Amino acid sequence: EQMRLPSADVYRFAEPDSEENIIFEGIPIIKAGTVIKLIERLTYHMYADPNFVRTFLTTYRSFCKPQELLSLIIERFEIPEPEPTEAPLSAELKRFRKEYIQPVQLRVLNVCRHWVEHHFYDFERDAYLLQRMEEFIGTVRGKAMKKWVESITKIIQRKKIAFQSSPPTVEWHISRPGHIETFDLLTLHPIEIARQLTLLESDLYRAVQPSELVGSVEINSPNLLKMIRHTTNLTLWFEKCIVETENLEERVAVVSRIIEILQVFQELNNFNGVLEVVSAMNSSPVYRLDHTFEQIPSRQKKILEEAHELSEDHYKKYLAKLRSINPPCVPFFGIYLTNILKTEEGNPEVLKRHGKELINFSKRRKVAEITGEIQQYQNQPYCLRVESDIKRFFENLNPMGNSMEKEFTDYLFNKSLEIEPRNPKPLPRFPKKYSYPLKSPGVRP
Ligand SMILES: Cc1nc(N[C@H](C)c2cc(N)cc(C(F)(F)F)c2)c2ccccc2n1
C-alpha cells in the first residue's frame, strides 16, 4: 500500500507525519500543523476534503500571505518522480503517477478554482498575484487537467466582469425633497430614516466577506471596517442628537423619534439597527436621563424595554426572532465580532512540540464556523427605493468630528450632566434650538 515517493530535499511535501509537524483531534480533523503539512492535507492524495478546503481558504491569511500560498501550491503541484532502482515493468512508478501525482495535481487545481470563485478579492487587491495564477495554470498540460484550467479561466473572466413587489412611496416630513441642508433627525420622516438606514446597513452587511473577520476583530478588512464605523457613527449620532438638545421638551421629541425609528427597524427586521438604538439608549449619557424618559409614553417605553431584552442571556430572544423571521432582514452584526473575540481570546496562535512551531488550525476552524453563519443572510435584497440624498446624509455622519471615541463619550457624559444635573442640583431651563414643529408624523405609511 505505501508508495515510493521522491526525496524530501527534492520535494518538501514528502516528509512523514510526526508530532513536530501535525496533530489531529471519517476524515481526521487537523488540530495543528506546519504550513507545509496543512498544504499537504489541503491537497491529499487519499481523499477529497471540501470542508478543509472551505475553512483553509477563509482562514489562511491569519498564518500565510496569499503570495506564499500560491508559491506553496505550485511547489505542491510540481512533483518529481522518484529515481529508478538502476532500471522495465516500472510498477511502483506507474502507480505513483496514478495514485499520488494525478489526485494531488487535480486537488491543487480544485483549490485554485475554489480560491478564485470564493475569494477573488485576494486577486483584486494584488494584480501580480492574479498574474502569477494565470501564468501557472497556463503551463498545465494534459487533457483531463486542461478542463480544470478552462473552468478556472472562465471563473477569472466572470469575476473580472463583476424587486419582488412594488416598493412603497418615499416618505417626507419637514425637509422637502432635495433640501439636503436641512436634513436632520427630526426634519426627515422617521419612516424614511429607518428605510434608508436599513438599505445602507443591508449593503454594508452583504459586502463583508467571511475572511475579513479572521485574526482581526485596512486592505485585509475594508468592508468590516466600513460596517464597524457605520455602527459607531450612527450610535454616537443618536447619543449626540439626544444630549446636545438641552431643552427638555425638544430632547423628549428627539428620544421619542429615535424609538419610532426603532419600531420601523423592527417592521423591516433590521436587527442591526434595533440594537444600534438600544446601544445608544443604554450608553451612560442617555441612560441616566430620568427627566427625559419620564415624559416618554408607556407604549414607547415597552418597545425599547423589549428591544433591550433581545440582548439578554447572550442574545437568546434575538436568535429566536432571527430564526423565526421571514427575509428580508439585516442580522445583528456585533454578535459575530463578540463570539469571534470570545473564541480567539486565550486561544494560542501556535502549538509547540520538540522545539518546533505548529499553527493552531483549531482556532481558525472555530472562527470559520462563526463567520460561516454570516453568509446565509447576505442574499436578501429589500423592496425599498433608495433616496440618494438621504443615503449620502447617513454615509457622511461624523458626530465625533476630530475627537477620539473615548474622549467624545466623556464629552457626551459631561453634556448629559449639564442638561440633567445630579439629584441635589437644580434642573436648568434651556432655550429652544429648533423652530420647526416637534410633532412626529408617525410610523404609519
Ligand atoms: C428592560 C431593560 N431595558 C434596558 N434598557 C433600555 C434600552 C432602555 C433604556 C433607556 N435609557 C430607557 C428605557 C425606558 F424604558 F425608559 F424607555 C429603556 C436595560 C438596560 C440595562 C439593564 C437592564 C435593562 N432592562
Last residue of some domain: 317, 344, 376? Answer: 376
What radius of gyration do the chain's Cα atoms show? Answer: 28
First to last CA, the chain: 73
Residue recorded with cell 420647526: 436
Q: Which residues pair with 22 in a beta bridge?
A: 33
DSSP 376: G
Same domain, 47 and 98: yes
Domain that holds residue 43: 4-160+334-376
Contacts with 41 (C-beta within 8 Å, 6 or more apart), sequence order = 22, 30, 33, 49, 52
Q: Determination technique for this PDB entry?
A: X-ray
Position of cell 457626551?
A: 412
Q: Dihedral of CA 148/152/157/159: which sign? A: positive
Per the structure, the count of domains in the chain is: 2
Residue showing cell 457605520: 230
For residue 394 the three cell numbers come to 447617513
Q: Does residue 98 share a domain with residue 24?
A: yes
Check whether residue 229 and residue 120 sit in a common domain.
no
Which strand (E) or helix (H) includes residue 23?
A: strand 22-24
Whether 317 is in the pocket of ligand 1, judged by its Cβ within 6 Å, is no
**How remote is the CA of residue 318 from the centroid of ligand 1, in Å?**
16
Ligand 1 atom nearest to 307, measured from its CA: 7
> What is the DSSP secondary structure assignment for residue 99, as one 8-state letter?
I
Picking from 74, 43, 47, 45, the residue whose alpha carbon sits closest to that of residue 56 is: 43
Q: Which residues of 330-342 are buried (b: 16+ CB within 10 A; e: fewer)?
A: bbbbbbbbebbee
Domain match, 220 and 366 both:
no
CA of 370 to the centre of ligand 1 (A): 29
Q: Indicate the SS3 state at residue 22.
A: strand
- Cα(386)–Cα(401) distance, integer angstroms: 27
The answer on 232 and 120 residing in a single domain is no
Beta carbons within 10 angstroms of residue 177's beta carbon: 10
Distance from residue 235's CA to the centre of ligand 1 (Å): 16
Atom of ligand 1 nearest to the CA of 302: 15
Q: Which residues contact 313 (CB under 8 A, 6 or more apart)?
A: none
Q: Is the CB of 286 under 6 A from ligand 1?
A: yes
**DSSP designation for 60:** G
Q: Are 103 and 115 in a shared domain?
A: yes
Where is the domain boundary, 321, 348, 376?
376
In this structure, the answer to whether residues 118 and 221 fall within a common structural domain is: no
Nearest atom in ligand 1 to the alpha carbon of residue 301 is 17
DSSP class of 295: T
User: What number of helices (H) and strands (E) belong to the chain?
Assistant: 20, 4
Residue 127 burial (CB count, 10 A): 9
Of the three residues 323, 358, 376, the one that is the final residue of a domain is 376
Cβ pair 52, 60 in contact under 8 A: no
Segments in 97-126 forming alpha helices (H): 102-118, 121-124
Indicate whether 344 and 224 sit together in one domain: no
Place of cell 503539512: 37
Report yes or no: 217 and 371 within 8 Å, Cβ to Cβ. no
CB-based contact 54:114 (threshold 8 Å): yes
Same domain, 372 and 426: no
Which atom of ligand 1 is closest in space to residue 293's alpha carbon? 16
The CA-atom distances, in angstroms, between 328 and each of 242, 263, 267 are 30, 16, 11
Mutate to test the pocket of ligand 1, among 254, 263, 277, 281 (most ligand atoms within 8 A of CB): 281
Q: Do residues 425 and 319 share a domain?
A: yes
CA of 444 to the centre of ligand 1 (A): 25
Same domain, 104 and 198: no
Q: Which three cell numbers stand for residue 306?
A: 423589549
**Cβ-contact 62, 210 below 8 angstroms:** no
Closest CA to 278 of 257, 252, 259: 259
* C-alpha cell belonging to residue 399: 458626530
The residues, any chain, with a CB within 8 Å of residue 311's CB and separated by 6 or more, are 275, 278, 318
Residues 411 and 311 in one domain: yes
